[PDB]
């Protein structure tokens, strides 16, 4: 019934962390481009950007493992 992909969640967690080991729980749209590519190597090089920009409609350049996953769930 409605099959998703609970596997990417595990890989993301490691990427969101492997990049945010500082123990902050938040990453800057900067690492993303680098974490997004090393995470699946599939997005563009200026589009994932527009996404991390839309984020500004709430926090302001800071994504939580939740947005991180919400930003990688759209384009893949
Ligand atoms: Mg941090």
Cα(35) to centroid(ligand 1), Å: 13
Domains contained in the chain, CATH given: 1-76 (1.10.238.10)
31 is in an annotated binding site: yes
Please tell me what DSSP assigns to residue 66. Answer: H
- The CA distance from 66 to 58, in Å, is 13
Largest CA distance in the chain: 38
What does the block give as tokens for 12? 């993301």
**First-to-last CA distance in the chain?**
22
CA distances from 19 to 1, 57, 58, 68 (A): 34, 23, 22, 12
Experimental method: NMR
Query: From residue 12, how far is each of 15, 29, 53, 57, 72 by CA, in Å?
Result: 5, 15, 20, 23, 9
State the residue for tokens 């998703």.
4
How far does the centroid of ligand 1 lie from the alpha carbon of residue 23, in Å? 6
Rounded CA-CA distance 72/55 in Å is 13
Q: Which two tokens stand for residue 65?
A: 């493992």
Q: Ligand 1 center to residue 24 CA distance, Å?
A: 4
Distance 3 CA to ligand 1 centre (A): 32
Contact 60, 21 (CB under 8 A): no
- Cα pseudo-dihedral 54, 68, 25, 3, rounded to 10: 140
Q: In the beta sheet, which residues pair with residue 63? A: 27
């Amino acid at each position: 019934d409605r099959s998703l992909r609970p596997e990417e969640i595990e890989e993301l967690r490691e990427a969101f962390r492997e990049f945010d080991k500082d123990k902050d729980g938040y990453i800057n749209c900067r690492d993303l481009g680098n974490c997004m590519r090393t995470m699946g190597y599939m997005p563009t090089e200026m589009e994932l950007i527009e996404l991390s920009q839309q984020i500004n409609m709430n926090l302001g350049g800071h994504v939580d493992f939740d947005d991180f996953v919400e930003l990688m769930g759209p384009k893949l």
